[PDB]
Scaffold this active site. Sequence first.
Site, mmCIF file in Angstrom:
data_model
loop_
_atom_site.group_PDB
_atom_site.id
_atom_site.type_symbol
_atom_site.label_atom_id
_atom_site.label_comp_id
_atom_site.label_asym_id
_atom_site.label_seq_id
_atom_site.Cartn_x
_atom_site.Cartn_y
_atom_site.Cartn_z
ATOM 1 N N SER A 95 0.846 -1.211 0.000
ATOM 2 C CA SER A 95 0.000 0.000 0.000
ATOM 3 C C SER A 95 0.873 1.250 0.000
ATOM 4 C CB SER A 95 -1.090 -0.005 1.019
ATOM 5 O OG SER A 95 -0.684 0.068 2.328
ATOM 6 N N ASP A 216 -10.246 -6.816 -3.580
ATOM 7 C CA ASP A 216 -9.481 -6.000 -2.616
ATOM 8 C C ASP A 216 -10.382 -4.820 -2.295
ATOM 9 O OD1 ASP A 216 -7.894 -3.927 -1.544
ATOM 10 O OD2 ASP A 216 -6.013 -4.857 -2.301
ATOM 11 N N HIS A 245 -6.914 -7.439 1.000
ATOM 12 C CA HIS A 245 -5.943 -6.345 0.789
ATOM 13 C C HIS A 245 -4.590 -6.658 1.431
ATOM 14 C CE1 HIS A 245 -4.510 -2.346 0.021
ATOM 15 N NE2 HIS A 245 -4.487 -2.016 1.353
#
EC number: 3.1.-.-
Length: 264
Positions: A95, A216, A245
Amino acid sequence: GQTLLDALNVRVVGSGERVLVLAHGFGTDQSAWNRILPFFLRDYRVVLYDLVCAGSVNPDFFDFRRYTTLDPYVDDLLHILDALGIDQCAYVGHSVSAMIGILASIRRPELFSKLILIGASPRFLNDEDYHGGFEQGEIEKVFSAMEANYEAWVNGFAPLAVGADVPAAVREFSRTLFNMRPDITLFVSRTVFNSDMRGVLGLVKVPCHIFQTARDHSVPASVATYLKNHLGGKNTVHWLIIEGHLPHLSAPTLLAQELRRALS
Ligand SMILES: [Mg+2]
């Protein structure tokens, strides 16, 4: 230099010579790598650290005036690699750490042999010709919920982020979110959820391996093909036909196998 190595809990482990950086994402600390870490210790020298916003970092290091964009996070990553005397590495970012890696590679094109991007998005907000997954009103509801009752927000968000029914992953992710100071989580969430990295992707020249799940919560599947088409180097998509995720928590055997393939 040594001050920052101590502040951000830098760890160097492993018996290998080739350097592998594992950089955690939003809501975790370097402990999110614990399930896959053993599979990299023989072949790599593994560098782990905590982002300044992690709950494991003293909150006195979180300079609100400084950390308003991703650029100072890039400064911290490069200061660590320079302090460790690392000339070249492979880098794995989940991320927000995927975007920090991208910016770092633009500044230092020689430092990264490849970037591995996990759960990565350059933009969460929808735009005319671009599906990020969220309207501004939906992002505003997240900030409002986070501010009104941080504990209720974490308890609702952690299972959505994990996606798959893996209670141990929900508990692990919830623990690191609860460790974060709520005003820091909200500030960082405004930095990340409102970010737009699209304009710089074509400046990247190193190869990128883009790991994307089939479901996700935070990252539509079409963002992975957007990244493949817009990052400026030789790009490979690794489709993970699972939900979630945080595959390093929820699917660590599959994730470690795919990471071994990406690094070869
Ligand atoms: Mg479901």
